[PDB]
């Protein structure tokens, strides 16, 4: 029965926290309030293990994620939208009724701001007006940001502004408080009273500030659209300045995350917007004193939604907003390589192509999706199942591979590229598709379309069980939990760390040819590509385990039993699948797609420097690309991931999402609405 040390920054907030403490003492977990001066003091308290959680604004949730605080957003607020209650709000600009000045005429006016560092009050409006050339701030060599704002505006009320005095001229109160972040004219509703009393011509607030402050006088104010029109206050869909992320509940990244959210689940369920108590956790909104509103939680919010455990401050705000805040403070492809083997092939690509391709080594393929969403890496090549999880993350494929003919990728008006998913067993083994429940299994990795998605999607259609370690006896699927039966048959890397059941090239049973090595050594069935039997047999694989392997040592498994020869994969397979793809962010789609063709013309199967380096040769290990790849054909512009896979493959990958979503899929499903 522990307690959560909450930290509040204002005295009115301390009274609401203490009234929250008296109502939660009966519960199993409880609360303790820590009075502090500013938000920077509460962040130093949580990193010092003195406090636990604060509801910060997006511009301040950026500040918590920096070292050494390294705090993490664990809960977000939910605002009301008529499309659906998502976790974002709009930044608008409110002016008086019937006045003449447009958005270009804001030079020399008087403004009211929410606070120095807030999203809707400072980052968005100043970010826009400096991007539109109105404010003059080439960089930090000019000086502070607010020195340019004091030169731009005549006078204003910026709570928390220290160096400049024009930003404190319009604030109400005695000198000691007028500038502080808890002044009367601070916050979303406090800056609106700067407008209503006449200290400013424009107030930079969120979209629903006018509705809760002046409910019946809504027509006495106008929103300042970026074209120059004074649209009314109910037109923020057409007049917003940006759409910014919600206010986030930051905390440490430790065991204390789980007991905080269970407390927030307890308090919201009893003190939400539909509660019957006199106490409300959110508001309730209405005409009140400006310092009495927005205490510990904004009055516009209606619920709290949990942030997934993989998010941080960078991936919460999005790329376009984090790049804006990073700007005010202060031809080459960045490939993502997984493991030591792909990194040792990629540095070879870097030196033969002279620096135009550079790469960062990671440990798993889900790290490539995050470093590309962060923009720290450019491109990566993913299997068909990982294209779906990168497509829901916001990335799009731009190029794909051909296996059938090098000539066909020229005439792009042709059949779509594809391969096949088969099940390979040993010769004299009597195992077929029916009695597969008691047998062992060998996959290529969990989540990939060849070994995991097609076979488990057939099984999930067969038995309807979302348990998939249970359906087999044991096996080796790289990336599955180490303490489960789908990791015991994994041989591991054999190095200093056992590295058992890891989803990189260190594992001996990882990959297309790796799952075949699991079949011959210790296994009963291998779920792999249609041609991996052909590539390894015939004396081509110089590995000791495959020294004398031949094509007749294996027999494919049809769906209706019916063990058939490996050369007839057109008839005896599980499902047709799309090929691998290179997924990237939509912004940099045009830059690499013509650049990757310049790399392929030098290093392809008809490349000029294939004596120097071959892009599509990997010594039967599939390093950065498969070895069946002949040429890369460009995917047309605007092709989304739902169009690239096709509705045939999109049906099974959508249904298999419901059983066990991964952590990389869970945070991206949070990012794109629900
Ligand atoms: Fe694949």
Curated annotation (Swiss-Prot):
Oligomeric and partner information: Monomer.
Post-translational modification: Different forms of hen transferrin are distinguished by their carbohydrate composition. Ovotransferrin and embryo serum transferrin but not adult serum transferrin, have bisecting N-acetylglucosamine. Transferrin secreted by embryo hepatocytes in primary culture is marked by the presence of (alpha1-6) fucosylation of the core N-acetylglucosamine. Serum transferrins also differ in the number of attached neuraminic acid residues. In both embryo forms, sialylation occurs on the Man (alpha 1-3)-linked antennae.
The family this protein is said to belong to: Belongs to the transferrin family.
UniProt keywords, alphabetically: Allergen, Disulfide bond, Glycoprotein, Ion transport, Iron, Iron transport, Metal-binding, Repeat, Secreted, Signal, Transport
Induction summary: Up-regulated by dietary stress. Increased expression at day 14 in the magnum of the oviduct in the corticosterone-fed laying hens (at protein level).
Coiled-coil intervals: none
Binding site for Fe(3+) 2: 383, 419, 512, 580
Protein name: Ovotransferrin
Molecular function per GO: ferric iron binding; iron ion binding
Carbohydrate-modified residues: 461
Disulphide connectivity of cysteines: 7-42, 17-33, 112-194, 157-171, 168-179, 225-239, 336-368, 346-359, 393-668, 409-631, 442-518, 466-659, 476-490, 487-501, 558-572
Binding site for Fe(3+) 1: 57, 89, 188, 247
Subcellular location: Secreted
PROSITE patterns membership: TRANSFERRIN_LIKE_1 (PS00205), TRANSFERRIN_LIKE_2 (PS00206), TRANSFERRIN_LIKE_3 (PS00207), TRANSFERRIN_LIKE_4 (PS51408)
């Amino acid at each position: 029965k522990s307690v959560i040390r909450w930290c509040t920054i204002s005295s009115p907030e301390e009274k609401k926290c203490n009234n929250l403490r008296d109502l939660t003492q009966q519960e199993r977990i409880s609360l303790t309030c820590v009075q502090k001066a500013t938000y920077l003091d509460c962040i130093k308290a949580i990193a010092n293990n003195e406090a636990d959680a604060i509801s910060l604004d997006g511009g301040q949730a950026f500040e918590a994620g920096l070292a050494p605080y390294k705090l993490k957003p664990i809960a977000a607020e939910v605002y009301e939208h008529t499309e659906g209650s998502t976790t974002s709000y709009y930044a608008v600009a409110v002016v008086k009724k019937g006045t003449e000045f447009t958005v270009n005429d804001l030079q020399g006016k008087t403004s009211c701001h929410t606070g120095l560092g807030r999203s809707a009050g400072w980052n968005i409006p100043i970010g826009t007006l400096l991007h539109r050339g109105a404010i003059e701030w080439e960089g930090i060599e000019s000086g502070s940001v607010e020195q340019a704002v004091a030169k731009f505006f005549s006078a204003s009320c910026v709570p928390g502004a220290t160096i400049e005095q024009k930003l404190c001229r319009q604030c109400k109160g005695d000198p000691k408080t007028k500038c502080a972040r808890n002044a009367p004219y601070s916050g979303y509703s406090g800056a609106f009273h700067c407008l209503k009393d006449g200290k400013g011509d424009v107030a930079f607030v969120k979209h629903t500030t006018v509705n809760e402050n002046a409910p019946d006088q809504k027509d006495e104010y106008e929103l300042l659209c970026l074209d120059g029109s004074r649209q009314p206050v109910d037109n923020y869909k057409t007049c917003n300045w940006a759409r910014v992320a919600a206010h986030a509940v930051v905390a440490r990244d430790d065991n204390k995350v789980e007991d905080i959210w269970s407390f927030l689940s307890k308090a919201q369920s009893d003190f939400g917007v539909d509660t019957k108590s006199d106490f409300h956790l959110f508001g309730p909104p209405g005409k009140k004193d400006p310092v009495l509103k927005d205490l510990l939680f904004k009055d516009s919010a209606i619920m709290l939604k949990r942030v997934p455990s993989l998010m941080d401050s960078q991936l919460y705000l999005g790329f376009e907003y984090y790049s804006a805040i990073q700007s005010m403070r202060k031809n080459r492809i960045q490939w993502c390589a997984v493991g030591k083997d792909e990194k040792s092939k990629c540095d070879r690509w870097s030196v033969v192509s002279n620096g135009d391709v550079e790469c960062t080594v990671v440990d798993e393929t889900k790290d490539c999706i995050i470093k590309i969403m962060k923009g720290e890496a450019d491109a990566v090549a993913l299997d068909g199942g990982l294209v779906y999880t990168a497509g829901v993350c916001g990335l799009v494929p731009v190029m794909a591979e051909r296996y059938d003919d090098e000539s066909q990728c020229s005439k792009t008006d042709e059949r779509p590229a594809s391969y096949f998913a088969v099940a390979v067993a040993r010769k004299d083994s009597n195992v077929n598709w029916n009695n597969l429940k008691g047998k062992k299994s060998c996959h290529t990795a969990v989540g990939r379309t060849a070994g995991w998605v097609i076979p488990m999607g057939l099984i999930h259609n067969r038995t309807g069980t979302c348990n998939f370690d249970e359906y087999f006896s044991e096996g080796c699927a790289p990336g599955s939990p180490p303490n489960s039966r789908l990791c015991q048959l994994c041989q591991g890397s054999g190095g200093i760390p056992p590295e058992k059941c890891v989803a990189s090239s260190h594992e001996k049973y990882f990959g297309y040819t790796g799952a075949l090595r699991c079949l011959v050594e210790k296994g009963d069935v291998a779920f792999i590509q249609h041609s991996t039997v052909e590539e390894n047999t015939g004396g081509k694989n110089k590995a000791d385990w495959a020294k004398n392997l031949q094509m007749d040592d294996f027999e494919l498994l049809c769906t209706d039993g019916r063990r058939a020869n490996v050369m007839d994969y057109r008839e005896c397979n599980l499902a047709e699948v799309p090929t691998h793809a290179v997924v990237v962010r939509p912004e940099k789609a045009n830059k690499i797609r013509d650049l990757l063709e310049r790399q392929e013309k030098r290093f392809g199967v008809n490349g000029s420097e294939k004596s120097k380096f071959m892009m599509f040769e990997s010594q039967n290990k599939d390093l950065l690309f498969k070895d069946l790849t002949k040429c890369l054909f460009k995917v047309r512009e605007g092709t989304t991931y739902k169009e690239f896979l096709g509705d045939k493959f999109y049906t099974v990958i959508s249904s298999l999402k419901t059983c066990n979503p991964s952590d990389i899929l869970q945070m991206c499903s949070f990012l794109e609405g629900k």
